[PDB]
């Protein structure tokens, strides 16, 4: 699992929330993470207390290594998962994600950000160190199956929206999480260095076609 999140916090927002839907501090500095690993803290986005929180969130969730996907098709009635389903929905907002076939490096076409589903243990803000997010995942299509069997849920800024509102229960996030999935169609990709790879190399080159 792998993704950037490159950009200024506004860069990510802009299509999600206006100004005063949001609680998240002015900061003009770009996130600046070409390749986002597993087990790091991340920025994740939820709703709260009728505004959006932007959160640092350790990316894995371990029971009693640990987790860091959760697949769509059984995690709103998985037994470890299907709370958090329905109580801990998130979105981590990213350029696009990597995978390997040779890595790829996948965006939309449109160069909007992806809007990628999470699900995990809220409060978010406590920076649990063992109980944090999962980002969900699907079966790959189109032209994704030539990549990798799976991929990221990736979801439209109104399902993101909508994806993220407490007064929406597990059942209304599974038709969501269903109707708002952007399909391959949306997306472009591209082959990227091998350099990805080692997370010791966080260089702005790692997106860019090889």
């Not at 505004?51 to 290594?65: E, K, N």
């Not at 350029?95 to 950000?113: L, N, S, T, V």
């Not at 109707?179 to 997106?207: D, M, T, Y």
């Amino acid at each position: 699992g792998r993704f950037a999140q490159s950009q200024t916090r506004e860069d990510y927002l802009a299509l999600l929330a206006e100004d005063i839907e949001r609680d998240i501090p002015y900061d003009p500095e770009p996130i600046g993470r070409y390749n986002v690993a597993p087990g790091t803290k991340v920025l994740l986005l939820s709703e709260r207390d009728e505004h959006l929180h932007l959160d640092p969130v350790f990316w894995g969730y371990a029971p009693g290594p640990p987790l860091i996907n959760a697949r769509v098709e059984t995690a709103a009635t998985s037994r470890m998962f299907k709370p958090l389903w329905q109580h801990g929905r998130a979105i981590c907002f990213a350029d696009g994600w990597f995978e390997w076939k040779q890595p790829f490096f996948i965006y939309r076409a449109d160069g909007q950000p992806i809007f990628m589903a999470a699900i995990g243990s809220t409060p978010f803000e406590r920076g649990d160190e063992a109980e944090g997010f999962l980002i969900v995942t699907a079966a790959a299509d189109q032209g994704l199956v030539d990549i990798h069997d799976r991929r990221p849920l990736v979801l439209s800024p109104e399902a993101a929206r909508e994806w993220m509102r407490q007064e929406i229960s597990g059942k209304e996030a599974s038709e969501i999480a269903a109707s708002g999935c952007v399909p391959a169609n949306q997306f472009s990709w591209h082959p990227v260095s091998r350099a990805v790879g080692n997370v010791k190399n966080q260089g702005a080159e790692l997106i860019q076609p090889v």
